[PDB]
Amino acid sequence: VIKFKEPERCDYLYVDENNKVHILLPIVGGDEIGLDNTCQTAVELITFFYGSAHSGVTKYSAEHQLSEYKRQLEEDIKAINSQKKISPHAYDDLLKEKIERLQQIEKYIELIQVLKKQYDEQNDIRQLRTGGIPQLPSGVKEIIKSSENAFAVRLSPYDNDKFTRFDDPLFNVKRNISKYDTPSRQAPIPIYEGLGYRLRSTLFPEDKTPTPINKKSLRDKVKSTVLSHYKDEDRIDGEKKDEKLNELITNLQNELVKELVKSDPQYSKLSLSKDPRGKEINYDYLVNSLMLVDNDSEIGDWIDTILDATVDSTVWVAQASSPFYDGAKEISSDRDADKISIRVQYLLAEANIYCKTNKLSDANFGEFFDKEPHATEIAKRVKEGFTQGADIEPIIYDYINSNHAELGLKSPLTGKQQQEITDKFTKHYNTIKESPHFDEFFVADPDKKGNIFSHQGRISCHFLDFFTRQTKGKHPLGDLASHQEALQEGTSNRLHHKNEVVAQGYEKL
């Protein structure tokens, strides 16, 4: 075995099953949702074209990395003549494969050079290096405009940032005047209309009246609901004690299985009359054998005791939280209201993405929800929801469904579709939860057919797609001219981070 230097991995570089080299132009960092937005949208392209320095580590340009990769292939190809003597025609296959990759890589190098030298009369590329807050090059914008599987969405945070860099968002709603368009640069000028305003002003009003968040654990909800029908003075005592206890057991059981069958229908058979060994839960058992309560105990203590004796502790294990419920007891500041408003808007945006990627609607949902009376209404229902501790996602889905037609939808969203949206929302929101700015996000679905791909933690397009567009078709691709279509013929737009085909020459050794 001879020591090869060709790496199994370079940035932006993917090799398919047929030994075609693809270069992937990055748009932003991330997998499905971009972590970069606004001010920082250009960061990946700056690096791809010019290199940069991140947290003290030098990141090299694509061109610089293709040159390094070329040297490495050339050294590997030199070493296969010498190797050739040890195996005249037993290293044949890998040599052909390496030369094929080399020729391709050389062509990409010429394309990057000719792009920067001949075809950047606009400075569309050079402004990545020179501009203050650079823009996406126009070819990237065109690729995004035309995408069928990736879409930007733009929201309305109170303290909005003017430097959005995704110009064709699918979802969009009215925004304030950014502080950065005001002479002091300190505060926005607010608008008193639209989805953003309604949410904020409903969730924490001019009054400063907090909105309570009454989210309980399943156990507390059930216990609280049962105890609704009792008063503090109520006891399990007197002549009818056995009968009052039975009433208690039955209400508690009905309430607990009602809540549980929402999530798991197996619990339709759950029973609180008996312990797991078949012992009757009755007065004598709880008071005189176990000694846990007595005639003077409050109804809440009896509930606790009943539950401790009959319910597996696996039934109390929680669901994963909604992003809507983060542990706070109240919405008690403008900042609390902004945070929730954004979460509501982001959910509407995910629903909008879902309907656009699955070809149900072309509408911008924000156009509908910015209008009265919808803006006020959805805000009001979300607020009620928090006060009741209700699930917030369905409140949004019902409102969508009651207006499906006006949102460009043939039919209401099915329960399955709602859950798919909720899951995307939850995962994408959590990835993005700590963003310094919430004005816009780019969201890509690499499991669908389209011009955007996922690769090495970058949301990307095909370099040749970009090249053809910035170049306006004036420089034909030659040997690479079918590479774009070849990547489309692949099974998934999600691309393996390593290049297996390069290691399968070392595996055979």
Query: Residue 308, interface with Hg ion (CB under 5 A)?
Result: yes
Neighbours of 217 (CB within 10 A): 10
Closest approach, Cβ 312 to its own copies, in A, equals 6
Angle formed by the axes of helices 463-470 and 92-117, to 10°?
A: 30
Does 86 bind its own copies (CB under 8 A)? Our answer is: no
- Tokens 């290199």 locate to 51
Say if strands 452-455 and 458-462 run parallel, antiparallel, or are unpaired.
Answer: antiparallel
Nearer to its own copies, 18 or 313 (CB): 313
Q: Which amino acid is at 99?
A: I
- Rounded to 5 degrees, what are φ and ψ at 372? -75, 150
What is the torsional sign of CA 218, 221, 225, 227?
positive
CB of 301 to its own copies, least distance (A): 6
Nearest to 246 by CA among 270, 228, 278, 271: 271
User: Which option in its own copies, Hg ion, none does residue 65 bind, with CB closer than 5 to 8 A by kind?
Assistant: Hg ion
Q: Candidates 102-110, 292-300, 408-416, 496-504: pick the segment binding its own copies (CB under 8 A).
A: 292-300
The span of 35-43, 139-147, 172-180, 249-257 binding Hg ion (CB under 5 A) equals: 35-43
Residues 323, 420, 145: CA angle, nearest 5 degrees: 95
Of the residues 293, 348, 349, 480, which one makes contact with its own copies according to CB under 8 A: 293
Stretch that binds its own copies, among 94-102, 143-151, 179-187, 485-493 (CB under 8 A): 179-187
Instruction: Tell me if 129 contacts its own copies by CB under 8 A.
Output: yes
Q: Give the bridge partners for 30, in sequence order.
A: 34
Closest CA to 151 of 406, 440, 427: 440
Q: How many residues bind its own copies (CB under 8 A)?
A: 68
CB of 42 to its own copies, least distance (A): 10
Task: Pick from 64, 78, 433, 498 the residue near its own copies by CB under 8 A.
Answer: 433
Question: Minimum distance from CB of 128 to its own copies (Å)?
Answer: 8
**From its own copies, Hg ion, none, interface partner of 55 (C-beta below 5 to 8 A by class):** its own copies
Choose the contact partner of 509 out of Hg ion, its own copies, none; CB within 5 to 8 A by kind: none
Judged by CB under 8 A, does residue 267 bind its own copies? yes
Determine which residue in the list 46, 309, 432, 477 makes contact with Hg ion, applying CB under 5 A: 309
Phi, psi angles (nearest 5°) of residue 245:
-60, -50
- Least Cα distance to 463 among 43, 68, 63 occurs for 63
> Is position 39 an interface residue for Hg ion (rule: CB under 5 A)?
yes
Identity of the residue, 220 or 308, whose beta carbon is nearer to Hg ion in the bound complex:
308
Smallest gap, in angstroms, from Cβ of residue 118 to its own copies?
Answer: 24
Q: Is the dihedral of CA 248, 249, 250, 251 positive or negative?
A: positive
Give 409: exposed, middle or buried? Use CB within 10 Å, 0-12, 13-18, 19+. middle
The residues, ordered by sequence, that sit 6+ positions from 118 with a Cβ below 8 Å of its Cβ are 475
CA–CA dist 285, 281 (Å, integer): 6
The single residue listed with the structure tokens 């208690």 is 248
Under the rule (CB under 8 A), what is the footprint of its own copies? 29, 35-37, 39-40, 43, 46-47, 50, 52-57, 129, 132-133, 180, 184-186, 217-219, 266-271, 274, 276-278, 285, 289-294, 296-298, 301, 304, 307-309, 312-318, 326-329, 332, 433-437
Under the rule (CB under 5 A), what is the footprint of Hg ion? 10-11, 13, 39, 65, 308-309
